């Protein structure tokens, strides 16, 4: 016969409201954090909303549900691409589980700092508050990438000549405590 | 406003391209805002996970069931219940011996059928079993 | 009558000559004791060194770090009702007390009072 499942277990929310009651409608606007500009969801965004990631034929019932079955109910066989897709789903799940386990072991070992972001992010973004009180070619490559992407701009030498080891200190005389100055 | 009237004639992109560039800028700002969050968050056992959330309103989103689960109260109230549930958690594919505390006559599936033998799984589009049990051993 | 906003008094911190910093240090023991005995809950967060708080333990107090308080990792533990909730910051250093008060104000808690360990002892909140 015919099969229609949007979930692994087949369960779902009540598709229809109670008789005589106002229904619930999804958010028509694109999920943009700023209140403006307001834009209606595109068809691709509606597909993402309904669960088909991006285009049709991907991560949805149109791909998960069996393509056919025998008239006596006998199911089809396992295709190589079907096994590959099962392995891909397992790979996503393994990525999630391993990332979560890494976070848990970092928190257990105490490697998660109390200050949000990295030092480069703190030196760049002013919206963050101030918190006071084998082979080696690949290693050299990582070091030079860090040296090139750490400080995108330098303090002008007219203020503090970095060749003499002179650095400027944070002058927070005109700062503000409320984040609205950067949010608005 | 002669400078403004002259600047109006100077534009490398049309209006739609400028709107797309500003959407890209907003996406970058969203990434920065998400990165400005702390690494962890101190919570409690009893309260629901969606209590200290920092946060186009009134409509249903794609994460409706997830938000409902986050709003409902937690099902493990005390560490005593946590450990009383976790001690009965059993691992099958773990490396090492396992106790026979409850029953003696009950033998394991590996103890009955060795380690190289698997049950014949129904192979169909809906049931995809782990082929080649020998490839899994590192 | 028209209500003068609380933010109208924040113009005092903009004084470049008499600014706050570029302080709840005085409390009546009896008044603080009766306030705590009327509240009867967990309203005290102690932000100080671990060795210090092991030397001077304070039960019924939340041991948090001021960096966590500023970053916002303790918001689901915070009372979640920022209007009627009044918090007591226990810090041996007045600078740490001011920093924790500023963090709580930034996260939305204006009713934050700084208390000392000797004040808490003489008020009787900490048992012995």
């Amino acid at each position: 016969y015919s099969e229609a499942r949007s979930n692994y277990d087949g369960t779902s929310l009540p598709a229809w409201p109670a008789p005589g009651k106002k229904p619930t409608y999804p958010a028509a606007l694109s999920e943009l954090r700023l209140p403006q500009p307001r834009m209606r969801k595109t068809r691709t965004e509606w597909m993402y909303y309904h669960g088909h990631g991006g285009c049709p034929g991907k991560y949805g019932p149109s791909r998960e549900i069996a393509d056919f079955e025998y008239a006596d109910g006998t199911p089809a066989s396992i295709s190589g691409r079907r096994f590959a897709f099962k392995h891909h789903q397992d790979h996503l799940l393994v990525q999630l589980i391993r990332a979560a386990a890494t976070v848990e072991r970092y928190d257990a070992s105490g490697l998660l700092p109390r200050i949000p972001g990295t030092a480069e992010q703190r030196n760049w973004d002013p919206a963050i508050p101030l918190f006071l009180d084998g082979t080696m070619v690949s290693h050299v490559c990582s070091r030079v990438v860090d040296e090139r992407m750490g400080t995108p701009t330098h303090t002008p030498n007219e203020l503090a000549n970095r060749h003499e080891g002179e650095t400027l200190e944070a002058n927070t005389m005109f700062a503000t405590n409320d984040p609205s100055a950067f949010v608005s | 406003r002669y400078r403004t009237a002259w600047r109006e004639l100077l534009h490398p992109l049309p209006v739609r391209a400028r709107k797309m560039e500003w959407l890209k800028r907003d996406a970058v700002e969203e990434n920065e805002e998400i990165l400005r969050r702390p690494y962890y968050t101190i919570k409690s056992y009893a309260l629901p996970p969606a209590v200290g959330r920092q946060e186009i309103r009134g409509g249903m989103h794609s994460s409706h069931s997830l938000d409902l689960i986050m709003r409902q109260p937690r099902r493990v109230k005390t560490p005593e219940q946590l450990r009383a549930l976790r001690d009965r958690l059993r691992f099958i594919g773990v490396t090492g011996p396992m106790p026979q505390a409850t029953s003696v006559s009950t033998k394991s599936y590996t103890d009955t059928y060795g380690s190289r033998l698997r049950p014949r799984y129904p192979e169909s589009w809906d049931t995809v079993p782990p082929h080649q049990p020998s490839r899994e051993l590192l | 009558a028209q209500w003068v906003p609380k933010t109208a008094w924040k113009v005092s911190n903009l004084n470049k000559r008499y600014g706050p910093g570029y302080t709840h240090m005085v409390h009546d023991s009896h008044k603080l004791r009766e306030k705590l005995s009327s509240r009867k809950g967990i309203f005290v967060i102690d932000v100080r060194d671990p060795g210090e708080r092991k030397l001077n333990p304070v039960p019924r107090s939340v041991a948090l770090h001021h960096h966590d308080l500023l970053s916002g990792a303790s918001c689901p533990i915070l009372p979640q009702q920022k209007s009627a909730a009044e918090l007591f910051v226990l810090a041996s250093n007045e600078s740490r007390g001011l920093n924790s008060a500023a963090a709580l104000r930034r996260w939305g808690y204006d009713s934050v009072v700084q208390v000392d360990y000797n004040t808490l002892v003489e008020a009787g909140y900490v048992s012995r």
């Binding site: 999630l96 998660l112 | 962890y40 968050t41 919570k43 409690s44 009893a46 | 809950g41 967990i42 967060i45």
Partner: peptide, 23 residues
């Protein structure tokens, strides 16, 4: 409700889902 959450405290981290939007 105006008091601090009682009981023991559990630390909860985060995970990122990163999607490449450009070549």
């Amino acid at each position: 409700a105006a008091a601090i959450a009682p009981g023991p405290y559990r630390r909860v981290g985060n995970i990122f889902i990163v999607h490449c939007d450009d070549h």
